[PDB]
């Protein structure tokens, strides 16, 4: 019966909420008392990557912490050299409408996707000199929100429909398809162990999946609007999100709760990007007020502000060594902060 | 200099990439982008068949002008998350099936989407090329089906010459910003090759206004 099934679902949801509440002794703010503050963070624009001619929608760092990839609304996808401002490649895209870009950990491939519902994967290192499309990944109905490389052979994708997918390069088919969401699924963030990954959707609910078994382990709620970005704690036992609710929240996998909320009354615009720093003490959040922010992780206090961009910050990421953070925005520039 | 040989060559290659990027941007600056929107029925495909996945593109040149048309009626997702990538489009093309009222009603859905596009915070300065197709079929079913079935406020005669003007003015009464942008209307049909010329004239007007704004004359 539909009525009986919905009543059971409601009472299991209540039971889960009760179990979560029963395992909350002291909040993160209370635990992080008598701990010294980070203080002001005076990051400076070390490099400005002024090559694009449209809105920077996505960025990703190489494992070397020196090679960048940027995707803009024009049919171009530039691969930069962070140290000396240069352009390693200018990859022409078959569809200028892009929403994501991913740099493979090995540096051999770069993936991109947008309103075409195609995760075009490119071959950076070939016997020729040009960069060519390795595979055109088809099978998503909605736009491609974000993609992340598990290795040179695998990639997960956050689509426009209520579906994520684990593709396998060398054969266009998708191995495991994750279907547990409602509404659009925005950016995802893989775990370091490459066995779980969190996903942000427009249902104000994030989910931790298991890429091997294909199921959803546990779900995280609390947000009041669509989650536009999500980043995963370096430890592997936490992650933080970002929503159009003008707030960010840090969740914990083994507690299943929200630990403490990154919301200031002075901010009304949403969050487009989120990236923990190394050791996970500073959380960078890219806001729509033509600006970024540096949010302390273990204390709600706000560190400095990265006011360098004329338009909305649509993308930002920390390097693997934590030495620099590069933030892209809807103005074609892409600054690197240190 | 204080650079090595490969460093200098890499800087030279980066400068070449800069030149190619600037050339491509100049090429794209000459291209007129036209977003395509429609009602529940896929009349955009039907009309574009006469002119001859998700987003689909239709490149064509008319009287020495490269055109871009972005039909995004197959996205089947939430329009909010991707309507913001379409600002800077020269003009937005919107089609309304004039015969699609005796079926919330479908013209009301069309008005809802028209309101959400015209009054969107991204398209304040973007003109809309409104198309009211199926004119013969509307003239055909206008007499049998009263307009009160979708226009309770309509009290005029059930004759085409006025029954189309009422719909045109009703659509024109949805843009709250009548100064930053303007709405162009054409009661098209299944047999009309002049729609390309209507779009061409509207695009010339829009680019004239954009040039005036750039040069400060407006």
């Amino acid at each position, epitope marked *: 019966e539909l009525d009986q099934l919905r009543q059971e679902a409601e009472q299991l949801k209540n039971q889960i909420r009760d179990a979560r509440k029963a395992c909350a002794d002291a909040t993160l703010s209370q635990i992080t008392n008598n701990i010294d503050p980070v203080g002001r963070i005076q990051m400076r624009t070390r490099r400005t990557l002024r090559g694009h001619l449209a809105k920077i929608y996505a960025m990703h760092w190489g494992t070397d912490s*020196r090679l960048l990839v940027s995707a803009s609304q024009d049919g171009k996808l530039i691969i930069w050299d962070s140290y000396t401002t240069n352009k*390693v490649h200018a990859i022409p895209l078959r569809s200028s409408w892009v929403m994501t870009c991913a740099y493979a950990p090995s540096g051999n491939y770069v993936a991109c996707g947008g309103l075409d519902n195609i995760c075009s994967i490119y071959n950076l290192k070939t016997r*020729e*000199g040009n960069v060519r499309v390795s595979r055109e990944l088809a099978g998503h109905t909605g736009y491609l929100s974000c993609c992340r490389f598990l290795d040179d052979n695998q990639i997960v994708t956050s689509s426009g429909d209520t579906t994520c997918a684990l593709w396998d390069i060398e054969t266009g088919q998708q191995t495991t398809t994750f279907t547990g969401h409602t509404g659009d699924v925005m950016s995802l963030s893989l775990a370091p162990d490459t066995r779980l990954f969190v996903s942000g959707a427009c249902d104000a609910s994030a989910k931790l999946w298991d890429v091997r078994e294909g199921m959803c382990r546990q779900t995280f709620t609390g947000h009041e609007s669509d989650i536009n970005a999500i980043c995963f704690f370096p430890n592997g036992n936490a992650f933080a999100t970002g929503s159009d609710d003008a707030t960010c929240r840090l969740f914990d996998l083994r507690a299943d709760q929200e630990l403490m909320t990154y919301s200031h009354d002075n901010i009304i615009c949403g969050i487009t990007s989120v990236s923990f720093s190394k050791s996970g003490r500073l959380l960078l959040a890219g806001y729509d007020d033509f600006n970024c922010n540096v949010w302390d992780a273990l204390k709600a206090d706000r560190a400095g502000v990265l006011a360098g961009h004329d338009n909305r910050v649509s993308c930002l990421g920390v390097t693997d060594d934590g030495m620099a953070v590069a933030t892209g925005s809807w103005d074609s520039f892409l600054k690197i902060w240190n | 200099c204080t650079l090595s*040989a490969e460093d200098k*060559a890499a800087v*030279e290659r980066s400068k070449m990439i800069d030149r190619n990027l600037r050339e491509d941007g100049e090429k794209a600056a000459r291209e007129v982008k036209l977003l395509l929107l429609g009602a529940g029925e896929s009349g955009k495909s039907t009309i574009v068949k006469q002119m001859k996945t998700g987003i689909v593109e239709t490149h064509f040149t008319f009287k020495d002008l490269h055109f871009k048309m972005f039909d995004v009626g197959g996205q089947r997702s939430e329009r909010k998350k991707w309507i913001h990538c379409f600002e800077g489009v020269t003009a937005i093309i919107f089609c309304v099936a004039l015969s699609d009222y005796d079926l919330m009603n479908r013209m009301h859905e069309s008005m809802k989407l028209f309101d959400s596009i015209c009054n969107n915070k991204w398209f304040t300065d973007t003109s809309i090329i409104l198309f009211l197709n199926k004119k013969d079929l509307f003239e055909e079913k206008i007499k049998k089906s009263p307009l009160t079935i979708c226009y309770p406020e309509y009290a005029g005669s059930n004759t085409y010459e006025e029954a189309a003007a009422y719909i045109q003015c009703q659509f024109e009464d949805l843009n709250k910003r009548k100064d930053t942008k303007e709405i162009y209307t054409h009661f098209t049909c299944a047999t009309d090759t002049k729609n390309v010329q209507f779009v061409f004239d509207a695009v010339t007007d829009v680019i004239i206004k954009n040039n005036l704004k750039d040069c400060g004359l407006f």
Partner: single-chain antibody, 232 residues
Framework: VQLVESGGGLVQPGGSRKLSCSAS????????MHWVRQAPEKGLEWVAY????????YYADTVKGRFTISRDDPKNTLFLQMTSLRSEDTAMYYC??????????????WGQGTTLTVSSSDIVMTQATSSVPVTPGESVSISCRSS???????????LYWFLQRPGQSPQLLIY???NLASGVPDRFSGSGSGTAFTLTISRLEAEDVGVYYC?????????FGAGTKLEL
């Protein structure tokens, strides 16, 4: 990805000719091309260069003014017009493609080369003893010094390593200090310090036999070295 050289013959002293190589199978418009020449029984010697877009042309001291190099993107062919040929320009000229970006492998593919017959401030790189007796299955450490420190301020030593199998074209082996080219096995592994350089072969078979060369790319004349010939 064959890059075939056409041209050459019995040119009279004081004559002139043009050497053309036709690239077939890669982005010629993006690859920057090098010309190198090899005496009939001696080592290699850099000649000319054309960068991508033909915007940077650099010449060797011996061929400066005498030789005019040209690039033709649409036909995917690279030229070399030679004027006032002397008695020492006889060689088996080689065409070398080279792409320059971060993480690139310059001097990667080498053309088959063409023969030429003429009738009747620099970084000195040296290879020790020019000859090494080896046997299959052993390990050999080929070393070559320099005249100036190759370690630039950006941290990468600008050394290379090439292999010339008998009757073949040179390959790319180690495209910087402690690097490895594409297609070469894991056996080759060379690492040095500053001016001194070494290359080590773990277990050499009959395939990795011939004369080896190391060149500098720090100061642009790209001086090569002698050959360390390996044989039983």
């Amino acid at each position: 990805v064959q890059l075939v050289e056409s041209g050459g013959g019995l040119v009279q002293p004081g004559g002139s000719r043009k050497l053309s190589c036709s690239a077939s199978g890669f982005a010629f418009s993006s690859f920057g091309m090098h010309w190198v020449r090899q005496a009939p029984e001696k080592g290699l010697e850099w000649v000319a260069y054309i960068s991508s877009g033909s915007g940077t042309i650099y010449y060797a001291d011996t061929v400066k003014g005498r030789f005019t190099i040209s690039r033709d993107d649409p036909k995917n062919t690279l030229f070399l017009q030679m004027t006032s040929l002397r008695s020492e320009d006889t060689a088996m000229y080689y065409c070398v493609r080279s792409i320059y970006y971060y993480g690139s492998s310059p001097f990667d593919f080498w053309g088959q080369g063409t023969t030429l017959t003429v009738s009747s401030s620099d970084i000195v790189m040296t290879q020790a003893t020019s000859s090494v007796p080896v046997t299959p299955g052993e390990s050999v450490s080929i070393s070559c010094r320099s005249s100036k420190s190759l370690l630039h301020s950006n941290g990468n030593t600008y050394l290379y390593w090439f292999l010339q199998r008998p009757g073949q074209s040179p390959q790319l082996l180690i495209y910087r200090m402690s690097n490895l080219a594409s297609g070469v096995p894991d056996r080759f592994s060379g690492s040095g310090s500053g001016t001194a350089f070494t290359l080590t072969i773990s277990r050499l078979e009959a395939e990795d036999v011939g004369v080896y060369y190391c060149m500098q790319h720090l100061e642009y004349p790209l001086t090569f070295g002698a050959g360390t010939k390996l044989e039983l």
